[PDB]
Write a protein that binds this ligand. Structure first.
Ligand SMILES: [K+]
Ligand SMILES: [K+]
Ligand SMILES: [K+]
Ligand SMILES: [K+]
Ligand SMILES: [Mg+2]
Ligand SMILES: [Mg+2]
Ligand SMILES: [Mg+2]
Ligand SMILES: [Mg+2]
Ligand SMILES: [Mg+2]
Ligand SMILES: [Mg+2]
Length: 148
RNA sequence: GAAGAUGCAGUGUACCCGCGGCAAGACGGAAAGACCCCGUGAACCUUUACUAUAGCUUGACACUGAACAU
């Protein structure tokens, strides 16, 4: 399948390219996500005349991602509370939904999809390092404090 | 004598007709022998008979994509 990339897609190419992908890749991911469109005469010529304004829509989104990230980096540490045993080990756990709400209430608004807990959910009291991904290339960070 | 005769030949016996009884024969009545054979007949059953086939199972392609390592 021939498609026209509407953004930077890693391992594929940059905005405006014309690449041959497997049909399933385009059908179930690139096109529904908005990352590409089928390379039909119209699209090709329309995207050719309509290009530099998308290049300005991308840099607007990339900067907006840079601005929200600096705010997340500005919260530094966010404390979360729960119940635990005496050995500090939680009975339940701490996932994305409640880390996101914690950062939301602490100021910066983050969705659960942006949280990236590397070592899974948090199941012990103390301080852990979680990461945030607000853009496909930028990456924020936050120290999370878990107390009983 | 189609080979076990009321009906043919020879011969013997025998007036015509009921009724109560008995079953030796009319190869008695009943059912186009079920046994046996035959038909290039039938059915259902069996199986390492033949040919197929549901099912079960194998791989290729499609629905079906992204990275990295070897
Ligand atoms: K006579
Ligand atoms: K009799
Ligand atoms: K035959
Ligand atoms: K039968
Ligand atoms: Mg005689
Ligand atoms: Mg009498
Ligand atoms: Mg009697
Ligand atoms: Mg008889
Ligand atoms: Mg007969
Ligand atoms: Mg037969």
């Amino acid at each position: 399948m021939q498609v026209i990339l509407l953004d930077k897609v890693a391992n594929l190419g940059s905005l405006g390219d014309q690449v041959n992908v497997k049909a399933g890749y385009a059908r179930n991911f690139l096109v529904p996500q908005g990352k590409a469109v089928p390379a039909t005469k119209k699209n090709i010529e329309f995207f050719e005349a309509r290009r530099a304004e998308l290049e300005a829509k991308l840099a607007e989104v990339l900067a907006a991602a840079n601005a929200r990230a600096e705010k997340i980096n500005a919260l530094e540490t966010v404390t979360i509370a729960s119940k635990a045993g005496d050995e500090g080990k939680l009975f339940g756990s701490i996932g994305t939904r409640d880390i996101a709400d914690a950062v939301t209430a602490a100021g910066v608004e983050v969705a659960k999809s942006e949280v990236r807990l590397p070592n899974g959910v948090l199941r012990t009291t103390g301080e852990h390092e979680v990461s945030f991904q607000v853009h496909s290339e930028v990456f924020a960070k936050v120290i999370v404090n878990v107390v009983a």
